[PDB]
Design a protein around this nucleic acid. Structure first.
Lengths: 67, 65, 65, 67
DNA sequence: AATGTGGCGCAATCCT
DNA sequence: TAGGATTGCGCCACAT
DNA sequence: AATGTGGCGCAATCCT
DNA sequence: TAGGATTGCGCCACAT
């Protein structure tokens, strides 16, 4: 009975749940997009550190090798 | 008019476009979640590399003593 | 000359370039291995979708009987 | 003793192992690149199938909905 | 011990 | 020439 | 049972 | 105008 009073209230409750479920999903996605930006900045920091330490190690190894 | 052949083809075409658009969006969101897993593992790896390089520097500098 | 400052800077610069080139190559190879995992999971998903769509078609066509 | 006879033969054995290890790694990589091409063709086939079935289902659902 | 791997350095070359 | 990107050869530390 | 999710359809709009 | 891409609203089947 798609005209029933009970029907329309059942539909309304589900419509409310649907908007709630999707807001949550869209928020989660937004939080994830932010996490990527955060992890990217951290990745770049680590890359710079690895490069700096690698060059430091290389120079030191060369010194010893020159004895 | 809903019986109009033009209406019918319009709905048919739009339903295809709507599904295509929604799949693309789902794909992007999944990729973003994927990048988080990727970056997380990679940063973990680089951090390990940092620690390894530091140990190698310490080892060499111990030769001075 | 190996004592030449020019030689020393040449080695220093090349060692950086060599490491950079080797890391890039390692990255590409890891990505390729990654795509295999990705595609494998995705094809599995699409196959599941194919099966689901077929069940839905069967269900609707059963209404005719 | 990096001039020893034993040393040079030890180095030769490792050099042989290194080339063997790397050929294997490079082959594995080559096989993986091929697998990606194979999985990509399969992915495209599946995408086409999903699209075709989806349109088939949509048309059929519309028919019923028009009763 | 002996072979298998992974990271580098060198130097010739290729590339811009 | 300058200078970065590749790559064959091979040393070494470490893993299996 | 009641809410939470995922997939669609419609139709207004935006975009090319 | 034609026609594909988005997106707010909401129906429904199914999951939890």
């Amino acid at each position: 009975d798609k005209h029933s009073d009970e029907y329309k209230i059942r539909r309304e409750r589900n419509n409310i749940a649907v908007r709630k479920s999707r807001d949550k999903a869209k928020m989660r996605n937004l939080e994830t997009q932010h996490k990527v930006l955060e992890l990217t900045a951290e990745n770049e920091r680590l890359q710079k550190k690895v490069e700096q330490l690698s060059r430091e190690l290389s120079t030191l190894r060369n010194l010893f090798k020159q004895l």
